[PDB]
């Protein structure tokens with residue numbers, strides 16, 4: 001008669017929650033239509049065949065039996081509805097049979113889905129890069145085109161059109177997918193398809209001026225330079241406005257009147273999140289959240305507007321709306337001991353108060369750039385209000401989904417139904433840095449305190465980092481073997 | 496201006512011909528809708544996940560550039576018609592575009608296709624085991640059923656029906672597929688799906704009394720016994736007469752009035768060859784062969800009824816009809832040493848005459864069991880006629896397709912258009928033995944001079960043999976890694 005936790009989703013949030021939740025203390029069931037976890041950062045490597053599926057996945061059932069002897073459960077179902085008042089969910093199986101399941105706690109970790117921005121033709125003609133199947137269909141399509149263009153029944157003009165790969169999105173995924181194809185094209189493809197090599201082209205399309213815009217400006221410049229040197233067409237300051245079967249249209253970001261029509265053989269849509277239908281439907285059943293576009297949780301990751309406080313959400317499907325500083329001005333004033341309401345006084349209690357208000361974190365509020373002398377209570381109120389307003393929810397990353405999962409599973413293991421049940425601290429994420437592979441052995445990294453901008457050892461750095469991020473020795477084994485395989489025998493052409 | 500050889504098929508015949516044909520001497524194009532070679536003997540290992548696709552395939556384009564600097568070509572096309580008088584073929588691409596190609600020599604190696612014996616429902620409901628895609632669909636279906644039966648919305652009786660795997664055919668493929676699933680079920684499946692393990696069953700269905708009927712009787716008995724000990728249902732002396740969506744019917748071979756209806760979740764059809772449509776159509780355009788069921792070639796592998804003798808066929812798509820001894824009686828009599836026509840006299844010239852008549856081979860004619868005293872010329876004629884009649888074409892195996900490919904490519908390299916062009920010997924195959932994996936570490940082997948019947952080292956023997964039969968170091972690399980992988984981390988569930 002253990003308390004029942006249902007986890008929705010087998011992704012970065014759901015799977016890492018499963019990995020850490022105590023199966024002895026709780027009865028845990030994970031529910032997802034996907035019976036494996038996907039190591040998403042390595043998906044671009046799958047498009048070119050640099051790494052294989054064994055590196056990029058984990059089967060959920062392999063992690064249901066922990067060392068202590070207590071077990072979790074897994075069900076291959078898609079959740080369609082949540083009924084928070086009666087504490088059950090409705091699911092369907094692959095045959096649309098309905099399943100009803102009761103819970104004591106619900107962890108919503110259903111992620112997000114691809115977003116076409118309703119641009120005509122994108123869903124019909126473009127390839128997304130969101131999961132294992134996506135990457136493999138992309139790889140297979142490219143391989144198919146190479147074989148098709150080796151046939152005698154096609155002209156050089158038609159080849160140039162068919163062998164043009166266009167990647168839409170200048171963020172890390174678009175960049176890495178482009179880099180991986182450029183390497184593949186320049187190495188194995190050049191060797192095995194020498195007669196059509198010269199007709200192959202790649203373009204990357206990005207609305208802003210910078211590839212990798214969330215990295216540093218020096219990294220962006222170096223990335224565009226590396227792409228130029230690789231003869232990739234860098235179409236920064238352009239965005240897609242229409243997609244047809246054999247061509248698409250782009251629009252200048254600098255001149256609204258300038259458009260271009262481009263022929264293509266493979267169109268890859270590397271960008272865009274939208275909310276799952278489950279989340280859209282769930283929102284409308286919570287009065288307080290009825291017209292939200294995204295699920296809001298509080299600073300403890302509890303879904304807002306649930307009287308029972310027994311539904312949580314983590315990862316890409318949620319945004320945090322923390323307890324407001326300015327609704328607790330007087331309490332905070334008393335807490336301040338340096339009696340003189342200054343920003344420095346507040347910062348002096350920031351260790352204690354961040355346990356309640358994550359927006360006070362030095363990672364969330366720049367105290368040095370927002371210093372304030374002595375304030376009246378009303379002015380202090382207004383200041384707290386600015387800190388509230390400034391709070392940024394965790395970015396939609398694997399990094400944050402993983403940290404939230406560990407935080408929350410630890411809360412269930414060591415705080416809930418124990419004498420620390422009222423000492424639960426708020427969630428505050430830690431940025432660990434970002435990495436990107438940008439072609440021809442060059443890796444860039446934007447880390448706390450370091451930037452990496454290519455060089456002979458940058459690819460070594462990437463391997464050292466990722467082998468430690470993999471979640472099993474099996475995957476690490478494959479990670480190592482795949483690089484040996486690729487070095488000695490090259491990328492595979494089997495499709 | 497080099498002479499053009501077109502090879503049809505990328506299989507055991509076609510690919511091994513490609514591996515050995517001199518690209519300097521000829522202009523070689525291989526044509527096949529499959530741009531990889533399939534190492535068919537390891538396909539059962541793929542069904543259970545014991546080995547991966549990288550062990551079982553070779554990409555054709557990897558072998559087009561030989562060390563000399565001379566190259567072959569490959570085109571992804573399906574051949575639809577041969578026009579032997581005008582020395583060209585018609586092909587289609589994957590989009591049904593027609594391609595016309597001329598040749599100086601044509602090597603037909605298109606193999607065979609699956610045969611349902613027109614039994615109602617097998618093409619609709621059964622899974623075949625002939626190529627990479629077949630094996631993977633079988634694996635995926637089995638994995639899908641396991642997940643479906645873990646759902647709460649299904650009774651135990653429905654589970655027993657759904658988790659029944661039936662394999663039709665008691666030859667090596669059927670036996671090996673059954674053994675691989677039995678191992679998978681008893682190991683990884685038992686561990687990951689403990690709650691439904693007890694509902695899983697496997698049956699193998701075979702018309703004759705023996706599993707592995709082409710092996711020795713001791714091997715057949717040991718195999719049936721090993722299957723019993725693994726609680727596999729061995730349905731020898733039964734054959735399938737009808738297949739429906741959820742059940743099939745079998746018929747006793749020993750009592751025509753006894754039938755049984757059996758429920759099943761996965762039905763695997765491991766047996767049956769039929770001729771390709773291409774061969775069926777080609778036959779009707781050759782007057783002398785117009786009503787044949789299979790393509791006949793002479794002792795030098797030349798298709799019969801082609802005035803230009805420039806079409807050859809090898810592998811499963813052909814049968815050899817050698818030059819008849821009895822149509823050359825007087826010539827043979829003169830060749831014989833002494834004046835007395837005895838079977839021993841014939842056997843004394845058997846080395847020389849076997850270069851012309853493969854049916855005189857000691858591997859084809861038992862001289863000791865057909866000893867003959869002094870014969871009159873007419874009696875000798877009748878004796879020769881018996882040898883002609885006794886000749887058996889090479890069995891449809893990878894071993895024979897490979898040997899035919901090496902024989903014929905060597906004929907092109909070293910006999911055709913050289914001063915040995917009239918010293919071309921007939922094709923005579925060499926039996927090297929057979930191997931089968933029969934479950935729970937047990938390997939059997941029927942070899943010249945040895946039989947292997949399981950034991951601790953039989954699996955080691957299997958590995959030693961197969962790693963030497965693989966056609967590249969890449970595949971051998973994967974062969975070794977896969978066994979390490981499977982030992983340390985188990986077979987994968989990713990699908």
Ligand SMILES: Cc1cc2nc3c(=O)[nH]c(=O)nc-3n(C[C@H](O)[C@H](O)[C@H](O)COP(=O)(O)OP(=O)(O)OC[C@H]3O[C@@H](n4cnc5c(N)ncnc54)[C@H](O)[C@@H]3O)c2cc1C
Pocket residue numbers: 008009010011012013014031032033034040041042043044077078079080109110111112129130131173276278314315316317396397398399400401
């Ligand atoms: C190509 C690519 C590269 C990336 N690289 C990085 C990187 O380098 N660094 C980084 O920090 N982040 C990276 N990310 C981001 C990271 O993948 C996401 O932020 C992360 O997936 C979020 O985790 P999640 O658990 O919220 O969603 P997901 O990991 O997507 O998991 C969602 C799960 O919910 C399941 N699900 C969906 N609907 C339902 C339903 N109705 N009922 C039950 N289950 C359902 C899905 O099958 C899936 O298992 C990358 C993403 C992509 C696509």
Ligand SMILES: Cc1cc2nc3c(=O)[nH]c(=O)nc-3n(C[C@H](O)[C@H](O)[C@H](O)COP(=O)(O)OP(=O)(O)OC[C@H]3O[C@@H](n4cnc5c(N)ncnc54)[C@H](O)[C@@H]3O)c2cc1C
Pocket residue numbers: 503504505506507508509526527528529535536537538539572573574575604605606607624625626668771773809810811812891892893894895896
């Ligand atoms: C599961 C399994 C296990 C086996 N195990 C063994 C074993 O242990 N030992 C053994 O000796 N034999 C074994 N065999 C038999 C062996 O696979 C066959 O005898 C062998 O494949 C015959 O070689 P082939 O070249 O004639 O045909 P295949 O190897 O089948 O090749 C035929 C090729 O022709 C291509 N093709 C088909 N139609 C056309 C067309 N119209 N135009 C152009 N190309 C075309 C096909 O795509 C294929 O590439 C096994 C077979 C199977 C199915």
Ligand SMILES: Cc1c(-c2ccc(Cc3ccc(OC(F)(F)F)cc3)cc2)[nH]c2cccc(F)c2c1=O
Pocket residue numbers: 046047048049050051052053136139492494495529548549627628631
């Ligand atoms: C091995 C291999 C494959 C692969 C595996 C299995 C198949 C199965 C398959 C399915 C259908 C087929 O019918 C048809 F002929 F139609 F394609 C053929 C094969 C195809 C490709 N992908 C990879 C993808 C990324 C990186 C990799 F390292 C690999 C890799 O190393």
Ligand SMILES: Cc1c(-c2ccc(Cc3ccc(OC(F)(F)F)cc3)cc2)[nH]c2cccc(F)c2c1=O
Pocket residue numbers: 045050182183184186187437439440441459460462463
């Ligand atoms: C090594 C290396 C490679 C790689 C693979 C193929 C090539 C092929 C290639 C590219 C450019 C070429 O023109 C030339 F070399 F002339 F510049 C020629 C071949 C180059 C690099 N990918 C990686 C991808 C991700 C993470 C990594 F750690 C690596 C990595 O460590």
Ligand SMILES: Cc1c(-c2ccc(Cc3ccc(OC(F)(F)F)cc3)cc2)[nH]c2cccc(F)c2c1=O
Pocket residue numbers: 053054132133136541542543544545546547548631634987989990
């Ligand atoms: C790794 C791996 C796989 C495998 C590879 C790629 C996929 C790709 C895939 C395609 C579609 C998907 O969407 C869906 F989930 F819907 F199926 C998911 C994955 C699936 C399985 N087969 C194997 C088969 C035999 C032996 C093996 F060792 C493997 C193996 O080691």
Ligand SMILES: Cc1c(-c2ccc(Cc3ccc(OC(F)(F)F)cc3)cc2)[nH]c2cccc(F)c2c1=O
Pocket residue numbers: 540545677678679681682932934935936954955957958
């Ligand atoms: C080793 C080995 C195996 C193998 C794989 C899994 C098991 C799992 C297993 C099966 C039955 C079990 O209950 C019992 F032990 F009772 F039999 C327990 C585990 C057993 C053998 N297949 C092979 C397949 C082909 C070629 C080979 F060379 C091997 C081989 O060398």
Ligand SMILES: COCCOCCOCCOc1ccc(C(C)(C)CC(C)(C)C)cc1
Pocket residue numbers: 041398399402432433434435464465468469
């Ligand atoms: C785990 O979340 C998945 C997100 O993957 C993003 C890749 O970014 C990696 C940067 O984060 C780090 C930081 C430090 C490290 C350690 C300390 C483990 C490795 C080291 C020594 C290379 C810095 C690893 C990864």
Ligand SMILES: COCCOCCOCCOc1ccc(C(C)(C)CC(C)(C)C)cc1
Pocket residue numbers: 464467468470471472473476
């Ligand atoms: C069962 O748990 C597996 C998941 O482990 C999660 C934490 O892993 C962090 C450490 O991971 C590694 C990975 C590789 C290595 C090796 C041995 C390859 C050495 C290295 C990374 C220093 C080069 C060391 C530690």
Ligand SMILES: COCCOCCOCCOc1ccc(C(C)(C)CC(C)(C)C)cc1
Pocket residue numbers: 536893894897927928929930959960963964
């Ligand atoms: C030639 O490839 C055709 C496919 O054959 C697959 C079945 O193999 C059956 C075994 O026949 C052989 C072939 C070679 C060998 C060698 C000589 C390579 C192995 C050895 C040294 C262990 C006896 C043994 C048995």
Ligand SMILES: COCCOCCOCCOc1ccc(C(C)(C)CC(C)(C)C)cc1
Pocket residue numbers: 959962963965966967968971
């Ligand atoms: C480029 O060559 C690839 C094709 O090779 C065909 C001929 O191969 C026959 C010998 O093959 C092997 C395979 C493995 C080995 C090793 C080194 C693994 C030793 C072994 C088989 C004795 C265990 C030796 C010879």
Ligand SMILES: [Mg+2]
Pocket residue numbers: 008009010011012013014015109110111315
């Ligand atoms: Mg998740």
Ligand SMILES: [Mg+2]
Pocket residue numbers: 010011012037038039040
């Ligand atoms: Mg995931």
Ligand SMILES: [Mg+2]
Pocket residue numbers: 110111112113316
């Ligand atoms: Mg998501």
Ligand SMILES: [Mg+2]
Pocket residue numbers: 009013108109110111112314315316317318
């Ligand atoms: Mg989520």
Ligand SMILES: [Mg+2]
Pocket residue numbers: 503504505506507508509510604605606810
């Ligand atoms: Mg062939």
Ligand SMILES: [Mg+2]
Pocket residue numbers: 505506507532533534535
């Ligand atoms: Mg083959």
